């Protein structure tokens, strides 16, 4: 995207919130809308229990995903200014 390394976005809708199996990639993927350009791209939350911190209409930083749905390119790094792995590790509370 763009010319930058990380993009910001709005979480439109957590697609695959009603998927059955817990660590499905359709369960982990989230449709976000990038601020700078306006397009809706899909991004992976790194973990299914870590999906619960991503709420609707939250400013979300996302980066590339460099390594079950092959081709979803982005991963959610920060949510509302706090790092998502820190939220998952219970280091910080999310400012809302």
């Amino acid at each position: 995207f763009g010319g930058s390394s990380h993009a910001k976005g709005i979480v439109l809708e957590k697609v695959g919130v009603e998927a059955k199996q817990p660590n499905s990639a359709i369960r982990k993927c989230v449709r976000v809308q990038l601020i700078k350009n306006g397009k809706k791209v899909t991004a992976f939350v790194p973990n299914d229990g870590c999906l619960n911190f991503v709420d609707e209409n939250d400013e979300v930083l996302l980066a590339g995903f460099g390594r079950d749905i092959p081709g979803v390119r982005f991963k959610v790094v920060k949510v509302s200014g706090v790092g998502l792995l820190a939220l998952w590790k219970e280091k910080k509370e999310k400012p809302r």
């Binding site: 059955k20 817990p22 619960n52 709420d55 609707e56 809302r96």
Partner: protein, 243 residues
């Protein structure tokens, strides 16, 4: 402390502070909204209470007791309002537990589960299960001992086994609502530990429920027992030689 379902909790949500008693329920694997009995450590569970309605995606805080003599960290739970409804669909597992009475090759008679043939006729065709993993089906009510039935299993079950039927009984939350009118004064409903320590009743503990170490002997089976007519009829190159 962990925080139990049924025990009251002071929610700060909207402009309202209100003490209500919630029901903690996990969304099992996105199928049935199964009722938990405690909140999970380090995990978001769903809660459900009877309070004022708020438009969703509204964050909230949640305390246990507005006391200054708490030695540490008065705020208990956080989160966000998911949705609002009337008549929620919370569901708790109820297992009807029985015992085998007579065991044939597949059909076993199962005794200490039901009380009458009316109850068995209601639960006809139900998916019964052994603790070991053997599936089975309730087939027919049994006449002469009232309350027993015939259930055809997958393979042969043992007399030591326990035969369970996993039904889902719905649980409705209670409709309690304290306002936390602090400037006027208010009665604060206590927790179950404070109630037990005050009115002197011990916590219920089942010795069959407390986990133990299981001494498993190494399973050795009997040798093969060939019948006499087959052992006398099979040919010379494969005849059994036993001194």
């Amino acid at each position: 402390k962990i925080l139990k379902t049924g025990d009251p909790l002071i929610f700060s949500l909207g402009w309202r502070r209100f003490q209500t008693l919630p029901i903690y329920s996990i969304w099992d694997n996105r199928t049935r909204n199964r009722m938990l009995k405690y909140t999970p450590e380090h995990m978001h569970c769903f809660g459900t209470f009877w309070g004022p309605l708020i438009a969703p995606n509204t964050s909230f805080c949640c305390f246990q007791s507005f006391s200054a003599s708490n030695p540490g960290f008065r705020i208990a739970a956080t989160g966000t309002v998911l949705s609002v409804d009337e008549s929620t669909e919370i569901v708790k597992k109820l297992k009807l537990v029985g015992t085998p009475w007579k065991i044939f090759k597949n059909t076993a008679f199962i005794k200490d589960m039901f009380n009458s043939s009316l109850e068995i006729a209601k639960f006809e065709g139900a998916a019964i299960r052994t603790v070991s993993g053997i599936r089975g089906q309730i087939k027919r009510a049994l006449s002469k001992p009232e309350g027993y039935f015939r259930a055809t299993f997958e393979d042969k079950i043992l007399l030591s086994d326990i035969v369970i039927l996993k039904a889902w009984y719905p649980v409705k939350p209670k409709q309690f609502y304290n306002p936390a009118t602090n400037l006027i004064g208010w009665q604060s409903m206590r927790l179950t530990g404070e109630i037990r320590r005050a009115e002197n009743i011990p916590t219920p503990q089942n010795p069959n429920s407390t986990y133990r170490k299981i001494e498993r002997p190494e399973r050795h089976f009997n040798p093969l027992r060939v019948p006499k007519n087959l052992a006398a009829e099979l040919p010379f190159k494969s005849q059994i030689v036993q001194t």
